[PDB]
Design a protein around this ligand. Structure first.
Ligand SMILES: Cc1nonc1C(=O)N[C@H](c1nc(C[C@H]2CCc3ncc(Br)n3C2)n[nH]1)C1CCCCC1
Lengths: 105, 108
């Protein structure tokens, strides 16, 4: 396999309100880094420690937890390079789910 | 620039800062493997919700709420020209990363 490859950055496209409607709702935080491509990554932060019940109240017996995705990004290498990068692997929170807590004495 | 160089020797970045949700969730899911030799990454894991409803306190399915996949817009590299080992174009796809439980949209 090659160490260095060429990439054409002219993206071709190939084929919601859940953050508010979820029992483990979240808000998005925009993370911008001019040394990275994509420069913007949107990260989810859970709104509550617990989950929302049928009445609209917080149920503390369950937990809202972020679902993290491993993703690759391009980091400019050398720094500030307009046209050369290295792949970097990061973790990004993409939303939240409601889980039963882990309990131990 | 239209064309850039990319070094494929990945470096991890903070993968050990805040490092079974798919099973513990009220909207559980399983991951399915999707392989495409013309794409980089060649393997993508896609979540599929286990149920239409969500799991309640009693351990039963609550049909009044819906499990939905959280889809994320992701970029991939597609070999260009086809079968090229070292040249690609970016393409945008949607990947289901996990599931959450939502109230349904209702028309009254
Ligand atoms: C997983 C997965 N399975 O297949 N490919 C990947 C994957 O990591 N692809 C990468 C990727 N795509 C994005 C779009 C971001 C849009 C904004 C955003 N906010 C939260 C997130 Br998560 N994102 C995602 N970033 N990095 C690209 C691979 C090749 C070089 C370019 C990057």
């Amino acid at each position: 396999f090659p160490r260095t490859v060429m990439v054409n950055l002219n993206i071709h496209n190939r084929n919601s309100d859940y953050y508010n409607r979820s029992t483990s709702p979240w808000n998005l935080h925009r993370n911008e880094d001019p040394e990275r491509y994509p420069s913007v990554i949107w990260e989810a932060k859970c709104r509550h420690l617990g989950c929302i019940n049928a009445d609209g109240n917080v149920d503390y017996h369950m937990n809202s937890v972020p679902i993290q995705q491993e993703i690759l990004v391009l980091r400019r290498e050398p720094p500030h390079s307009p046209n050369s990068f290295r792949l970097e692997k990061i973790l990004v929170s993409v939303g939240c789910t409601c889980v039963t807590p882990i309990v131990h004495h």
